[PDB]
């Protein structure tokens, strides 16, 4: 992020990305610049039922019949093979279409990320005739080894933000 | 382009993209912002022998055996079907690796773009911790109808600059 971007995001970081952090947990914040309109980036990332369309490592994701996307709905993720996780059950914790804030929590499954909770926010930037997006994503998770959990989780979040960027930029081509 | 980008490119436009324009010709300048390092964009676009790797509409492109990329070498392009051209023979007019300037001329083939000549230049931008590229491409061509030639040529150049952008940005992903 540029100094101006960090300066303009300080409010959103305090509002949506601040945690009460204890030694038993680890947590981080990551950012991704996306050269696409924020309303487009948001339309992609808000689909709690289809994380495989903007994330890596998902073999399948199922939701219940007559699914309704609202707080408390869940998704059943099966991870691709060869990762430190097999399955994950996840709950939509907040969906704020007006402020472009969403977040989820892991509530079950076979994996090593107990009490994982994540928040994603999408931000509009405008300067001269330029319009672009920054996405912020933060998480908190139990810390079982200590540096490995953070290293693994950070790399996944970064790779997934990058995939979101490629999808939105593909859609935004004139 | 932003006002600052246009301001910083004014020199390069005067240096490399100015033409003596007569009513029998048409000409235009187009720009493409690319979110990748300029040395990467340049390594792609300087390959006179492989335009199909950064342009649309090319069925095949052949160069002679023991090809040497230097001024006066040629390429034999076959266009995909359904366009107002079948074949084109093109000559490398200038290759300046130090200044990132290259240009070519059409010297034969079955098409409607007689005396087409093009110049492409690649420009480094740097602000705070951001590094990005702008590519400028200009052409001059005979004007046979008058608005159609410009409309066709402009749309092709714009689409090809966009393809170059997608290729370089794919390569630049962290
Ligand atoms: C393979 C990463 C992953 C994805 C996953 N589901 S998800 O991609 O739909 C949402 C997500 C959860 C946890 C992380 C670190 C990234 C993304 C669930 C788990 C338990 C893991 C692990 N390990
Ligand atoms: C199909 C566009 C095209 C490409 C082409 N060869 S090329 O793509 O390798 C370089 C090029 C030439 C002319 C234009 C307008 C764009 C690119 C030659 C011709 C005569 C045409 C036409 N019409």
Curated annotation (Swiss-Prot), chains A, B:
Q: Which residues carry this modification: Phosphothreonine?
A: 74
Q: Where is this region: START-like?
A: 19-169
Q: How is it modified after translation?
A: Ubiquitynated and degraded by the proteasome upon binding to the E3 ubiquitin-protein ligase RSL1 at the plasma membrane.
Position of sequence motif Gate loop: 81-85
User: What highest taxon heads this organism's lineage?
Assistant: Eukaryota
Motif Latch loop: list the residue ranges: 111-113
Could you describe the subunit structure of this protein? Answer: Homodimer. Binds ABA on one subunit only. Interacts with HAB1, AHG3, ABI1 and ABI2 when complexed to ABA, and possibly with other PP2Cs. Binds to CARs protein in an ABA-independent manner, both at the plasma membrane and in the nucleus. Interacts directly with CAR1 and CAR4. Interacts with CARK1 in the cytosol. Interacts with AIP1 in an abscisic acid-dependent manner. Interacts with FREE1 (via N-terminus). Interacts with the E3 ubiquitin-protein ligase RSL1 at the plasma membrane.
Record text about domains? Upon interaction with ABA, the 'latch' and 'gate' loops change in conformation leading to a tight dimerization and the creation a surface that enables the receptor to dock into and inhibit the PP2C active site.
Q: What does this protein do?
A: Receptor for abscisic acid (ABA) required for ABA-mediated responses such as stomatal closure and germination inhibition. Inhibits the activity of group-A protein phosphatases type 2C (PP2Cs) when activated by ABA. Can be activated by both (-)-ABA and (+)-ABA. Promotes drought tolerance.
Something else the entry says is: The synthetic growth inhibitor pyrabactin inhibits ABA-binding and subsequent PP2Cs inhibitor properties.
What is the protein's name according to its record? Answer: Abscisic acid receptor PYR1
Species whose genome carries this gene? Arabidopsis thaliana (Mouse-ear cress)
């Amino acid at each position: 992020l540029t100094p101006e971007e960090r300066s303009e995001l300080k409010n959103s970081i305090a509002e949506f990305h601040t945690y009460q952090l204890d030694p038993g947990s680890c947590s981080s914040l990551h950012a991704q610049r996306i050269h696409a309109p924020p309303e487009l980036v948001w339309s992609i990332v808000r689909r709690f039922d289809k994380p495989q369309t903007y994330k890596h490592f998902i073999k399948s994701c199922s939701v219940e019949q007559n699914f309704e996307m609202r707080v408390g709905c869940t998704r059943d993720v099966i991870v691709i093979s060869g990762l430190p996780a097999n399955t994950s059950t996840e709950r939509l914790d907040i969906l704020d279409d007006e402020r472009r804030v969403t977040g989820f929590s892991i509530i079950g499954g076979e994996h090593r990320l107990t009490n994982y909770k994540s928040v994603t926010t999408v931000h509009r930037f405008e300067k001269e005739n330029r319009i672009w997006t920054v996405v912020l994503e933060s998480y908190v998770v139990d810390m079982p080894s200590e540096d490995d959990t953070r290293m693994f989780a950070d790399t996944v979040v970064k790779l997934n933000l990058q995939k979101l960027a490629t999808v939105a930029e593909a859609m935004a081509r004139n």
